[PDB]
Design an enzyme around this catalytic site. Structure first.
Site, PDB file in Angstrom:
ATOM      1  N   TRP A  22       2.085  -7.106   4.104  1.00  0.00           N
ATOM      2  CA  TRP A  22       0.801  -6.578   4.048  1.00  0.00           C
ATOM      3  C   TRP A  22       0.055  -5.453   5.252  1.00  0.00           C
ATOM      4  O   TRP A  22      -0.532  -4.871   4.715  1.00  0.00           O
ATOM      5  CB  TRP A  22      -0.754  -7.116   4.072  1.00  0.00           C
ATOM      6  CG  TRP A  22      -2.078  -7.153   3.697  1.00  0.00           C
ATOM      7  CD1 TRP A  22      -3.233  -7.067   4.756  1.00  0.00           C
ATOM      8  CD2 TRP A  22      -2.417  -6.798   2.710  1.00  0.00           C
ATOM      9  NE1 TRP A  22      -4.046  -6.740   3.762  1.00  0.00           N
ATOM     10  CE2 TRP A  22      -4.289  -6.669   2.591  1.00  0.00           C
ATOM     11  CE3 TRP A  22      -1.850  -6.615   0.940  1.00  0.00           C
ATOM     12  CZ2 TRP A  22      -4.732  -5.811   1.596  1.00  0.00           C
ATOM     13  CZ3 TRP A  22      -2.704  -5.378  -0.086  1.00  0.00           C
ATOM     14  CH2 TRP A  22      -3.755  -5.445   0.684  1.00  0.00           C
ATOM     15  N   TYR A  43       2.996  -1.945   2.134  1.00  0.00           N
ATOM     16  CA  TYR A  43       2.913  -3.286   0.959  1.00  0.00           C
ATOM     17  C   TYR A  43       1.509  -4.232   0.258  1.00  0.00           C
ATOM     18  O   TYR A  43       1.410  -4.533   1.024  1.00  0.00           O
ATOM     19  CB  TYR A  43       4.375  -4.137   0.929  1.00  0.00           C
ATOM     20  CG  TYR A  43       5.442  -3.413   1.203  1.00  0.00           C
ATOM     21  CD1 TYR A  43       5.844  -3.823   2.744  1.00  0.00           C
ATOM     22  CD2 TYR A  43       6.189  -3.095   0.557  1.00  0.00           C
ATOM     23  CE1 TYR A  43       7.407  -3.006   3.053  1.00  0.00           C
ATOM     24  CE2 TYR A  43       7.768  -2.407   0.674  1.00  0.00           C
ATOM     25  CZ  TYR A  43       7.891  -2.504   1.690  1.00  0.00           C
ATOM     26  OH  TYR A  43       9.459  -2.163   2.284  1.00  0.00           O
ATOM     27  N   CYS A  61     -13.267  -0.973  -3.942  1.00  0.00           N
ATOM     28  CA  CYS A  61     -13.818  -2.196  -3.429  1.00  0.00           C
ATOM     29  C   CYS A  61     -14.649  -2.920  -2.836  1.00  0.00           C
ATOM     30  O   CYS A  61     -15.543  -0.671  -3.315  1.00  0.00           O
ATOM     31  CB  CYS A  61     -13.145  -2.634  -1.762  1.00  0.00           C
ATOM     32  SG  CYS A  61     -10.906  -2.125  -1.827  1.00  0.00           S
TER      33      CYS A  61
END
Lengths: 229, 108, 229, 108
Positions: A204, A208, A224
């Site tokens: 992370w 990825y 977000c």
């Protein structure tokens, strides 16, 4: 009073979501810990915790495992997981002390590649046959071998999609599907990871976005939320 | 993932508001995937736009007080500064092309 | 004597394949018609015939439908099937006189594209979420709404892959999964189509090797066999 | 799907065995997917190799008697003929490149 599923399976999909809706309406007010706790004894035999061991497995695993020590954590090893993912599993299972249940295919990577070949190159139907033999079937076999009637999963309404059709509780394959950290958001998970000294998946923090399998399998609404205003 | 002039609430006053030139600020967080998603793009832009634009990143996780100051609604939000004064603001994860266009148009 | 599944589901996946193995060993000697016939009354309530309406649906449909008139033919309409596929369905349902049961998503094509977007572009997990909401869930809902305990499917050991782990009979989701034309090969299917005046899928005679969905979803060991020698 | 000099058991003697030149025969069937899979490739080859090679297709469905004559084990099998006499034989579905190479090498 303890819920009967042998009667719930004798009910259609809509009467199910409606009858269960009255119970879910209550689970919606409780926190992740309360839902797991409620599930512990209001639901029947064998409670399993299936994980994918991805970017946020540490959350559900630690939470559910602390609540219930040595709980059957199901890991359906496809055979081509990221190397750092395995070490992430072996790192967690030792750190969190988990009763790990590994379920791989009936045949191995080399076997599948010789018998069928690189299924992922063979389009969607090939990927379907791949997901069926590597994830679906192994899971269906895990639930039976472990004799579970209750199953916990660390799914969120945020990851890909699980809008108000994915209740905290449910019945997938004749088993009470529970999703405690369902209403949780990325902040809450990140905070949980920090508060408990748990780390994110090693990948992370590289690029990825959502790790899973390697072989041309792995490679987020533009935003977000700090909460709109 | 992130490798550029990293900011804080303390350095905001000097490194941005009192900076001589154009500065692109990236309000991000460790949890926002689409934020980490644009990290390599911002690095590439920092390389090509060297000398002209100063690329920076602010992490709301430990530096929350500055996001509300510019009305940030939801990271990843890019704030373009020109001599301490804010020029434009882009919300959400963008592509290299859309980022170049966003920058060029305002930079001039 | 009539098989009990409420006891078969109370058995592991291997005891299941072993116990059922003795029965399958017998189904292996009978023909497709004999298997459907045997299944008609040796197995319990509600027998459904799920079809995809592809290159060779006409076979299983005609065979099973002739055996059992107005049988619940399940068609899980994903929403983006080939235009010629729909007309192929509407052509068959009228020619074969089928009791068609259509099961599409909870939301439509436009709804899914606005709620999630083009899932097929979002990698495997997106395709999984797509297949779950468009095929899996709708099917799981179909079996329940139709109250089936027996389910016939026109699967072959040849199409993509269903080697000796796919018995003529089985239990997928608490339902007796039957595959009559399992040992059949392309010749036998082609011959069946000819002998009964049934035609292949309109696209097969153009280039589409295996039609299904359109939206970047659809687009064969190097050989077939006259029998090696 | 298939659009070329289509053969039969009757025409085999004249159109192939008594043909003056090089002929590529494609033993296929309506059910063999990988056979229909190479149809467009054979059409393209027929276009480019015009004058030099005569492309043909035989359907075993109604013309079975000729497959055993050349020991065909499993369609799609390609039989290259040079003045009635068989040169080479390729089994299975092939790519345009592999087909060109297969042809060129033997054609000469």
């Amino acid at each position: 009073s303890k819920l009967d599923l042998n009667a719930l399976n004798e009910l259609p999909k809509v009467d199910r979501i409606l009858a269960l809706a009255e119970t879910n309406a209550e689970l919606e007010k409780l926190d992740a810990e309360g839902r797991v706790a409620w599930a512990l004894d209001n639901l029947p035999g064998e409670y399993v915790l299936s994980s994918s061991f991805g970017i946020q497995a540490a959350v559900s695993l630690h939470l559910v495992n602390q609540i219930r020590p040595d709980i059957p954590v199901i890991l359906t090893d496809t055979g081509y997981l990221f190397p750092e993912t395995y070490r992430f599993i072996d790192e967690l299972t030792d750190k969190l002390k988990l009763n790990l249940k590994v379920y791989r295919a009936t045949e191995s990577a080399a076997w599948q590649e010789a018998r069928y070949g690189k299924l992922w190159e063979q389009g969607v139907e090939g990927i379907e046959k791949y997901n069926d033999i590597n994830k679906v079937e192994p899971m269906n076999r895990a639930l039976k071998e472990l004799n579970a009637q209750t199953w916990f999963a660390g799914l969120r309404r945020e990851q890909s999609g699980s809008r108000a059709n994915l209740p905290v509780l449910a019945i997938q394959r004749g088993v009470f599907k529970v999703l405690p950290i369902i209403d949780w958001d990325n902040r809450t998970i990140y905070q949980y990871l920090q508060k408990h000294g748990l780390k994110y998946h090693p990948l992370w923090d590289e690029g990825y976005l959502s790790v899973g399998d390697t072989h041309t399998t792995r490679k987020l609404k533009r935003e977000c939320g700090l909460h709109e205003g | 993932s992130d490798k550029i002039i990293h900011l804080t609430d303390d350095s905001f006053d000097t490194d941005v508001l009192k900076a001589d030139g154009a500065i692109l600020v990236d309000f991000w967080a460790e949890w926002c995937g689409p934020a980490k998603m644009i990290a390599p793009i911002l690095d590439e832009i920092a390389d090509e736009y060297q000398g002209k634009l100063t690329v920076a990143k602010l992490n709301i996780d430990q530096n929350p007080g500055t996001a509300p100051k510019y009305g940030i609604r939801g990271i990843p939000t890019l704030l373009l500064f020109k001599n301490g004064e804010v020029a434009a603001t882009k919300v959400g994860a963008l592509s290299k092309g859309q980022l170049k266009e966003f920058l060029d148009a305002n930079l001039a």
